[PDB]
PDB file of C-alpha atoms in Angstrom:
ATOM      1  CA  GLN K 145      53.658 -41.752-101.713  1.00  0.00           C
ATOM      2  CA  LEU K 146      57.002 -42.833 -99.920  1.00  0.00           C
ATOM      3  CA  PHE K 147      58.803 -45.237-102.544  1.00  0.00           C
ATOM      4  CA  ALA K 148      58.292 -46.940-105.799  1.00  0.00           C
ATOM      5  CA  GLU K 149      60.590 -49.993-106.009  1.00  0.00           C
ATOM      6  CA  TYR K 150      60.976 -49.942-110.148  1.00  0.00           C
ATOM      7  CA  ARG K 151      61.831 -46.242-110.091  1.00  0.00           C
ATOM      8  CA  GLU K 152      64.928 -46.701-107.595  1.00  0.00           C
ATOM      9  CA  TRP K 153      68.354 -46.556-107.735  1.00  0.00           C
ATOM     10  CA  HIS K 154      68.831 -49.554-105.498  1.00  0.00           C
ATOM     11  CA  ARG K 155      66.912 -52.532-106.194  1.00  0.00           C
ATOM     12  CA  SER K 156      65.569 -55.618-104.066  1.00  0.00           C
ATOM     13  CA  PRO K 157      68.597 -57.756-104.947  1.00  0.00           C
ATOM     14  CA  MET K 158      71.299 -55.450-104.136  1.00  0.00           C
ATOM     15  CA  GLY K 159      69.275 -55.318-100.547  1.00  0.00           C
ATOM     16  CA  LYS K 160      69.004 -59.034-100.781  1.00  0.00           C
ATOM     17  CA  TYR K 161      72.720 -59.486-100.945  1.00  0.00           C
ATOM     18  CA  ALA K 162      73.403 -56.777 -98.489  1.00  0.00           C
ATOM     19  CA  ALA K 163      70.717 -58.518 -95.900  1.00  0.00           C
ATOM     20  CA  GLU K 164      72.878 -61.884 -96.177  1.00  0.00           C
ATOM     21  CA  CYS K 165      76.414 -60.625 -95.624  1.00  0.00           C
ATOM     22  CA  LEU K 166      79.031 -62.093 -93.057  1.00  0.00           C
ATOM     23  CA  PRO K 167      80.430 -58.534 -92.343  1.00  0.00           C
ATOM     24  CA  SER K 168      84.147 -58.269 -92.829  1.00  0.00           C
ATOM     25  CA  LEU K 169      86.168 -56.544 -95.202  1.00  0.00           C
ATOM     26  CA  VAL K 170      85.408 -58.714 -98.069  1.00  0.00           C
ATOM     27  CA  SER K 171      81.796 -57.796 -98.013  1.00  0.00           C
ATOM     28  CA  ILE K 172      82.704 -54.043 -97.512  1.00  0.00           C
ATOM     29  CA  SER K 173      84.616 -54.752-100.873  1.00  0.00           C
ATOM     30  CA  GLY K 174      81.856 -56.408-102.452  1.00  0.00           C
ATOM     31  CA  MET K 175      79.449 -53.901-101.850  1.00  0.00           C
ATOM     32  CA  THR K 176      81.892 -51.359-102.989  1.00  0.00           C
ATOM     33  CA  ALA K 177      82.072 -53.373-106.297  1.00  0.00           C
ATOM     34  CA  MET K 178      78.279 -53.605-106.666  1.00  0.00           C
ATOM     35  CA  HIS K 179      78.006 -50.042-107.193  1.00  0.00           C
ATOM     36  CA  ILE K 180      79.786 -50.427-110.726  1.00  0.00           C
ATOM     37  CA  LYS K 181      77.978 -48.644-113.321  1.00  0.00           C
ATOM     38  CA  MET K 182      76.804 -51.035-116.010  1.00  0.00           C
ATOM     39  CA  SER K 183      77.817 -49.000-119.229  1.00  0.00           C
ATOM     40  CA  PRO K 184      79.702 -49.124-122.558  1.00  0.00           C
ATOM     41  CA  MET K 185      82.446 -46.820-120.924  1.00  0.00           C
ATOM     42  CA  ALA K 186      82.245 -48.463-117.737  1.00  0.00           C
ATOM     43  CA  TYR K 187      83.237 -51.655-119.428  1.00  0.00           C
ATOM     44  CA  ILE K 188      86.174 -49.921-120.869  1.00  0.00           C
ATOM     45  CA  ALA K 189      87.199 -48.829-117.461  1.00  0.00           C
ATOM     46  CA  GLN K 190      86.686 -52.221-116.367  1.00  0.00           C
ATOM     47  CA  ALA K 191      88.688 -53.922-119.345  1.00  0.00           C
ATOM     48  CA  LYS K 192      91.699 -51.852-118.462  1.00  0.00           C
ATOM     49  CA  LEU K 193      91.955 -53.250-115.175  1.00  0.00           C
TER      50      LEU K 193
ATOM     51  CA  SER E 854      72.811 -68.459 -94.834  1.00  0.00           C
ATOM     52  CA  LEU E 855      72.370 -67.644 -90.725  1.00  0.00           C
ATOM     53  CA  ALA E 856      75.214 -66.607 -88.675  1.00  0.00           C
ATOM     54  CA  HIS E 857      74.981 -67.696 -84.937  1.00  0.00           C
ATOM     55  CA  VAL E 858      74.989 -64.951 -82.562  1.00  0.00           C
ATOM     56  CA  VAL E 859      75.978 -67.239 -79.468  1.00  0.00           C
ATOM     57  CA  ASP E 860      79.568 -68.608 -79.020  1.00  0.00           C
ATOM     58  CA  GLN E 861      80.325 -72.199 -77.652  1.00  0.00           C
ATOM     59  CA  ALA E 862      81.517 -70.443 -74.154  1.00  0.00           C
ATOM     60  CA  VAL E 863      77.753 -68.935 -73.482  1.00  0.00           C
ATOM     61  CA  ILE E 864      76.087 -72.178 -74.158  1.00  0.00           C
ATOM     62  CA  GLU E 865      78.767 -73.986 -71.769  1.00  0.00           C
ATOM     63  CA  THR E 866      77.298 -71.485 -69.555  1.00  0.00           C
ATOM     64  CA  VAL E 867      73.922 -72.324 -69.614  1.00  0.00           C
ATOM     65  CA  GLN E 868      74.669 -76.123 -69.794  1.00  0.00           C
ATOM     66  CA  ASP E 869      76.558 -75.523 -66.341  1.00  0.00           C
ATOM     67  CA  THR E 870      73.411 -73.622 -64.957  1.00  0.00           C
ATOM     68  CA  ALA E 871      71.192 -76.838 -66.185  1.00  0.00           C
ATOM     69  CA  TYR E 872      73.649 -79.364 -64.097  1.00  0.00           C
ATOM     70  CA  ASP E 873      74.042 -77.106 -61.080  1.00  0.00           C
ATOM     71  CA  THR E 874      73.208 -79.055 -57.927  1.00  0.00           C
ATOM     72  CA  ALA E 875      73.342 -75.562 -55.754  1.00  0.00           C
ATOM     73  CA  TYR E 876      71.078 -73.869 -57.650  1.00  0.00           C
ATOM     74  CA  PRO E 877      69.498 -71.421 -55.274  1.00  0.00           C
ATOM     75  CA  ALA E 878      65.810 -72.417 -54.733  1.00  0.00           C
ATOM     76  CA  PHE E 879      64.416 -69.330 -53.229  1.00  0.00           C
ATOM     77  CA  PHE E 880      64.873 -67.731 -57.052  1.00  0.00           C
ATOM     78  CA  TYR E 881      61.761 -70.095 -57.490  1.00  0.00           C
ATOM     79  CA  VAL E 882      59.903 -68.255 -54.754  1.00  0.00           C
ATOM     80  CA  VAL E 883      60.644 -65.255 -56.680  1.00  0.00           C
ATOM     81  CA  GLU E 884      59.586 -67.025 -60.193  1.00  0.00           C
ATOM     82  CA  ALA E 885      56.370 -68.205 -58.204  1.00  0.00           C
ATOM     83  CA  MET E 886      55.950 -64.265 -57.147  1.00  0.00           C
ATOM     84  CA  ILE E 887      56.616 -63.214 -60.841  1.00  0.00           C
ATOM     85  CA  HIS E 888      54.431 -65.811 -62.584  1.00  0.00           C
ATOM     86  CA  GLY E 889      54.985 -64.190 -65.907  1.00  0.00           C
ATOM     87  CA  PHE E 890      53.252 -60.602 -65.179  1.00  0.00           C
ATOM     88  CA  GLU E 891      55.123 -57.699 -66.501  1.00  0.00           C
ATOM     89  CA  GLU E 892      53.940 -55.215 -63.733  1.00  0.00           C
ATOM     90  CA  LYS E 893      55.061 -57.390 -60.837  1.00  0.00           C
ATOM     91  CA  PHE E 894      58.353 -57.723 -62.567  1.00  0.00           C
ATOM     92  CA  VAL E 895      58.720 -53.844 -62.665  1.00  0.00           C
ATOM     93  CA  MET E 896      57.496 -53.920 -58.885  1.00  0.00           C
ATOM     94  CA  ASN E 897      60.258 -56.649 -57.838  1.00  0.00           C
ATOM     95  CA  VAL E 898      63.255 -55.471 -60.117  1.00  0.00           C
ATOM     96  CA  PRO E 899      65.609 -54.774 -57.284  1.00  0.00           C
ATOM     97  CA  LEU E 900      65.441 -57.960 -55.800  1.00  0.00           C
ATOM     98  CA  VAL E 901      66.109 -59.871 -58.867  1.00  0.00           C
ATOM     99  CA  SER E 902      69.029 -57.468 -59.554  1.00  0.00           C
ATOM    100  CA  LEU E 903      70.400 -58.611 -56.233  1.00  0.00           C
TER     101      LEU E 903
END
């Protein structure tokens, strides 16, 4: 009634990384770079940089 | 992948407490009166504070 794991934006492995961080600016940038969409035009935007 | 929360200084502190010769024995009497009961610790907290 409150949560369904498959019908969710943030799956379990993304929590698995975040549990085992060693909190610093490196982990902040890692978690920021994990939110990147996995898409064709997102691949274009990745391929530019 | 664990990160330790205790640094080396506080372990040095606890080690120093272990090797204390002049550890105050009156504390044991307190511990003897406490003997692991919650309510009696709540009773005797202004002594363990001092």
